[PDB]
Nucleic acid binder design. Structure first.
Ligand code: MG
Ligand code: ZN
Lengths: 346, 49, 225, 168, 104, 96, 49, 48
DNA sequence: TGCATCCGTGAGTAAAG
DNA sequence: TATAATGGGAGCTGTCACGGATGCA
């Protein structure tokens, strides 16, 4: 029913390691990575493709997919080919294959054994914009990174090194996903520094700070205008389905008018403008009207240069400019006489 | 009642900061985020039925 | 519960492989497989261990359900249900009628049952879920965008957890979360808790809610405006 | 032509992809500084269309002479902006997901087709029990595994990965 | 004293009323059987016999040894329209619904 | 609303009133030319300021929104003709 | 005539309203005691009797 | 006051929690410049 | 073949808000 | 990037009637 209860149960299935089992699993992981290095040395294959093949066989045919970094599409055919090229090795060479397989199995069991630590850390990051489960999964990603980077030779328990990458992944996800308008990680850091600074200023000032006080407390390079611009850029959107009034009757978005689509008055005024422009252009000859329509973009949407209109009509650019000028002059005279286009100039 | 709810949220934040942090230097000012209480009261007075 | 088979020469199967009775384990084919199980090559002990287990295909989720639905031969089922319609017990006739109704709906329509399972999820045009600047420079936006963002974050993290070979508990959790993300996108509130925005008890407004009710599309904007 | 009927039917993944003009790959809406849509996000003009009539995102093509042209620099068609109300996109899922309408609208159409009760369809769909598609000659608790059988997690692990235990 | 808008709704939805009257599934003649503790009514055809057991204080619209039509009311109260439909047919139910609605 | 220079709501029951009168054309005006037939409302305003009779309306935009919101639920909704051949109410603007 | 850079967005009297102006309040960013929400340069209020 | 149980250290301070709206003389409030009134609510009394 | 029991769903219009 | 850290909190409640699916005896 409750998905977090279900995941907590599945987590409570795998038992917690003893120091010996932890050291053993970590050791097998390290030696398996070394063995994949050695198998790349021998076979001259790609270390990542080798790792993917060993992983594919350890997990089963249940999961097989194309990996982004690999140059070849990872399907059971090619994994069988590579597994056969591996199985045709001498004993002291083929030994590294068993090493790598056991290392991958240890990797899986180490992650599964330490899945509870992720939960016990992530429970303290709720309410920052991410679901509990979302935090748990991002922490599990951190746990996978920790497993792949751990060094058992340092004699540190695994929890210590894993907590670092777990916090890292949780905080990266909070910084990368919480906002509907995405903000770069460094800008989120600056925004939260501003928040904490203003909260300290209010906790010492007995009131909310002004922009200038926050600029003071922020140091050099910070003035009131920059605090204001940072607060402006940090503003989060609001829901169009926000309730208005105390019934379930109206949404906030219902009062927002559409500025994009033209109003019927706008469309009609554009139509009357085009028709009056054709009216005034019919008082010119066909050539001066066509030159004006070409030079202003009413024919094909774009404005032509004098050289293009002159090449189209077969005249010099000075002549096409002169007939454009006389067309404009006739239009100015007709407009002064009839005043049929003034009101459209707003 | 709304004050009590804001206080409960403030206390959750307080314990959150108590678990971590340099426990040599932790003042009351370093543990109290007044924002949840402020928000609860502001909500009651602006958008309550 | 395993079966031991020591070896003296080059072994032919590696750790993790699935073994059936009659499979060659090691020593050029001399030592072979007795029971069904999974191969644990022990180089310390120089024995090829086999822990008894079947290669059983048992899945979870909409992937399993989609497989089964693809596997339905509709005419065959129609025949079985017609035979069931001749049964004395009224309950069995009733159930076979209720099932045969769905079967014949799919048959006469030309819709594949598996289509009730989504592989590609459609995305509404952006103007129908706007992101608009209200008078004064702030932004207002539809809830569908946050539902789609939940969906896309969880789907992307699933693709990465797969590409990075994650354990089964984790992939299972991700897949559960993905199904629930889709469910909230389409009919938020229907199963389980309704998805809310942070710092608010208000349920987000999904596609079903846009379609139905007093304020739904039909009654609010199509049968009257 | 004149509209006379309106049909409604299920849509295949191929049909849904036929509607889509692009896959939405990033959970991002618009850029916090430019206030322009992000690439491969929910508002991308490459997918859904131009924001301004007959004008691509960068600005290379800005009149009606270009119609249907897809800009090479930014990839936005030059048509009317009204199309941002009509052009679908799609999300390609890693794992298929059930359309809740066909699950929770009792009696469930899926669960009726497969003779699966509401509880069983819930348990399989939200990852609480396995279901067998091939037993590969498995045997559980003295009876062989029949297809479409509901195994708990303990049972599936005992069958697929064998029995064992460790004692201190 | 009426039932009003709830009665109209109970009719338009064809809901089996709470204070439902009992009707005869067949024709026949009536034979009452009333112990001081229990009460029943029997409708007897020329080869058939139906038994309608009902609580003690129910008001009867029937006199002993009378000839009742199939679907005729025996108890007082509102007739179940679906029982009327099975016993007496569509025209009977149409008459009943129209008249009962018009009463309000 | 008056503050938004808004229009009156002609709701479900007002529609029933127009139906019971058999004012098919008055009703169709309410549903298209006066509310959300974009081309229709523009063309009506232009015809009236020119002195012409108002044009025959076309599809209300909210029905197009309904079609697209059903597509968003993986339901294919298809306007057909009497020959059961699809009709495009989107005028090609959303078919590749 | 060149098209001016700006456009008329003035606050006019809505339909069916009006009267006699009796108060104007003006607040500007950079003025003593005054701080508006981020972004706004100035706020003007007119009271009509 | 903060107290570490083992250390015995006791640090004390008066912290600022924000503002509480005051009620005017006539029993009303002033929230964001507009007078508001909190309406008493009737409910089932606790008990058995 | 019959009942109790549970889950889902709907519960007036316009106005202002 | 390294002390060790390993299973969560919030429910929140004066209808109501029906219809249809599930559950028992
Ligand atoms: Mg400064
Ligand atoms: Zn471009």
């Amino acid at each position: 029913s409750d998905p977090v209860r279900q995941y907590l149960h599945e987590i409570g299935q795998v038992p917690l390691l003893t120091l010996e089992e932890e050291v053993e699993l970590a050791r097998k992981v390290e030696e398996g990575m070394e063995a994949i290095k050695k198998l790349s040395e021998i076979t001259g294959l790609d270390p990542d493709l080798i790792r993917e093949v060993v992983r594919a066989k350890i997990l089963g045919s249940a999961r097989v997919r194309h990996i982004p970094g690999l140059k070849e599409t990872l399907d059971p055919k090619t994994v069988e080919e590579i597994d056969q090229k591996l199985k045709s090795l001498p004993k002291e060479h083929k030994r590294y294959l068993h090493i790598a397989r056991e290392g991958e199995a240890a990797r899986q069991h180490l992650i599964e054994a330490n899945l509870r630590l992720v939960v016990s850390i992530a429970k303290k990051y709720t309410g920052r914009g991410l679901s509990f489960l979302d935090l748990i999964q991002e922490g599990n990603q951190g746990l996978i990174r920790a497993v792949e980077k751990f060094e058992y030779k340092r004699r540190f328990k695994f929890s210590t090194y894993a907590t670092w990458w777990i916090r890292q992944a949780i905080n990266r996800a909070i910084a990368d996903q919480a906002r509907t308008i995405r903000i770069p990680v460094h800008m989120v850091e600056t925004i939260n520094k501003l928040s904490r600074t203003a909260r300290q200023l209010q906790q010492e000032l007995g009131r909310e700070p002004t922009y200038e006080e926050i600029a003071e407390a922020m140091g050099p390079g910070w003035d009131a205008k920059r605090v204001e611009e940072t607060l402006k850029i940090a503003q989060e959107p609001v829901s169009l389905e926000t309730p208005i009034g105390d019934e379930k009757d109206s949404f906030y978005g219902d009062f927002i008018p559409d500025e994009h689509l033209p109003s019927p008055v706008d469309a009609a005024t554009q139509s009357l403008l085009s028709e009056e422009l054709e009216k005034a252009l019919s008082k010119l000859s066909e050539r001066e009207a066509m030159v004006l329509k070409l030079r202003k973009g009413l024919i094909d949407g774009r404005e032509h240069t004098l050289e293009e209109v002159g090449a189209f009509f077969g005249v010099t650019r000075e002549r096409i400019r002169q007939i454009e000028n006389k067309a404009l002059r006739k239009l100015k005279y007709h407009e002064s006489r009839t005043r049929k286009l003034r009101d459209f100039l707003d | 009642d709304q004050f009590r709810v804001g206080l409960a949220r403030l206390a959750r934040g307080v314990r959150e900061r108590m678990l971590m942090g340099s426990e040599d230097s932790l003042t009351p000012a370093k543990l109290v985020n007044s924002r949840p209480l402020e928000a609860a009261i502001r909500e009651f007075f602006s958008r309550s039925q | 519960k395993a079966r031991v088979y020591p070896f003296e020469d080059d072994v032919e199967v590696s750790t993790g492989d699935r073994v059936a009775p009659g499979d060659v384990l090691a020593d050029g084919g001399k030592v072979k497989s007795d029971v069904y199980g999974r191969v644990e090559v022990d180089l310390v002990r120089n024995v090829v261990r086999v822990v008894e287990s079947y290669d059983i295909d048992a899945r979870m989720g909409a992937e399993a359900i989609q497989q089964l639905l693809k596997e339905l031969d509709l005419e065959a089922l129609e025949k079985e249900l017609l035979e069931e319609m001749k049964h004395p017990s009224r309950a069995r006739r009733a159930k076979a009628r209720k099932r045969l109704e769905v079967v014949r709906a799919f048959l006469d329509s030309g819709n594949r049952p598996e289509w009730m399972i989504l592989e590609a999820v459609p995305v509404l045009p952006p103007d129908l879920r706007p992101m608009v600047q209200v008078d004064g420079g702030r932004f207002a936006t539809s809830d569908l965008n946050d539902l789609y963002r939940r969906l896309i974050n969880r789907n992307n993290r699933l693709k990465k957890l797969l590409a990075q070979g994650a354990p089964e508990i984790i992939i299972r959790n991700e897949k559960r979360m993905l199904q629930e993300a889709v469910d909230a996108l389409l009919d938020n509130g229907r199963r389980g808790a309704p998805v809310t925005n942070p710092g608010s008890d208000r349920p987000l407004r999904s596609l079903t809610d846009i379609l139905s009710g007093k304020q739904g599309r039909f009654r609010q904007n199509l049968l009257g405006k | 032509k004149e509209v006379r009927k309106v049909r409604i039917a299920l849509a295949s993944p191929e049909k849904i992809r036929s509607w889509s003009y692009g896959e939405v790959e990033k959970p991002e809406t618009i850029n916090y500084r430019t206030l322009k849509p992000e690439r491969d996000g929910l508002f991308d003009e490459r997918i859904f269309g131009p924001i301004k009539d007959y004008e691509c995102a960068c600005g290379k093509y800005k009149r009606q002479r270009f119609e249907g042209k897809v800009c090479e620099r930014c990839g936005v068609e030059v048509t009317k902006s009204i199309v941002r109300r009509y052009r679908m996109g799609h999300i390609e899922l890693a794992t298929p997901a059930a359309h809740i309408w066909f699950v929770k609208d009792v009696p469930s159409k899926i669960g009726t087709l497969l003779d699966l009760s509401a509880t069983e369809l819930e348990q399989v769909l939200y990852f609480s029990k396995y279901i067998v598609l091939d037993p590969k000659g498995a045997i559980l608790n003295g009876v062989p595994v029949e297809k479409r059988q509901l195994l708990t997690d303990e049972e599936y692990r005992e069958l697929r990965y064998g029995k064992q235990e460790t004692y201190p | 004293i009426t039932q009003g808008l709830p009665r109209v709704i109970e009719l338009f939805e064809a809901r089996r009323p709470k204070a439902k009257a009992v009707i005869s599934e067949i024709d026949g003649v009536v034979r009452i059987e009333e112990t001081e503790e229990k009460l029943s009514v029997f409708v007897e055809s020329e080869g058939f016999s139906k038994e309608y057991k009902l609580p003690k204080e129910a008001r009867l619209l029937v006199k002993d040894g009378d000839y009742v039509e199939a679907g005729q009311p025996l108890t007082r109260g509102a007739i179940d329209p679906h029982q009327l439909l099975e016993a007496k047919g569509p025209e009977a139910v149409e008459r009943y619904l129209v008249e009962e609605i018009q009463k309000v | 609303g008056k503050a938004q220079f808004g229009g009156q709501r002609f709701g479900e029951m007002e529609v029933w009133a127009l139906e019971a009168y058999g004012a098919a054309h008055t009703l169709q005006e309410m549903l298209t030319l006066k509310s959300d037939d974009i081309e229709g409302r523009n063309a009506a305003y232009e015809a009236i300021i020119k002195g012409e009779d108002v044009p025959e309306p076309s599809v209300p935009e909210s029905f197009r929104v309904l079609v697209k919101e059903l597509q968003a639920l993986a339901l294919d909704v298809q306007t057909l003709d009497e020959k059961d051949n699809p009709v495009d109410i989107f005028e090609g603007l959303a078919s590749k | 005539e060149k098209a001016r850079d700006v456009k008329d967005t003035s606050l006019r009297v809505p339909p069916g309203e009006g009267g006699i102006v009796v108060r104007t309040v003006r607040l500007r960013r950079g003025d003593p005691g005054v701080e508006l929400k981020p972004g706004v340069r100035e706020v003007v209020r007119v009271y009509v009797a | 006051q903060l107290i570490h149980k083992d250390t015995g250290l006791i640090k004390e301070d008066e912290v600022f929690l924000g503002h509480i709206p005051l009620m005017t003389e006539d029993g009303s409030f002033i929230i964001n410049g507009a007078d508001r009134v909190i309406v008493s609510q009737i409910h089932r009394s606790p008990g058995v």
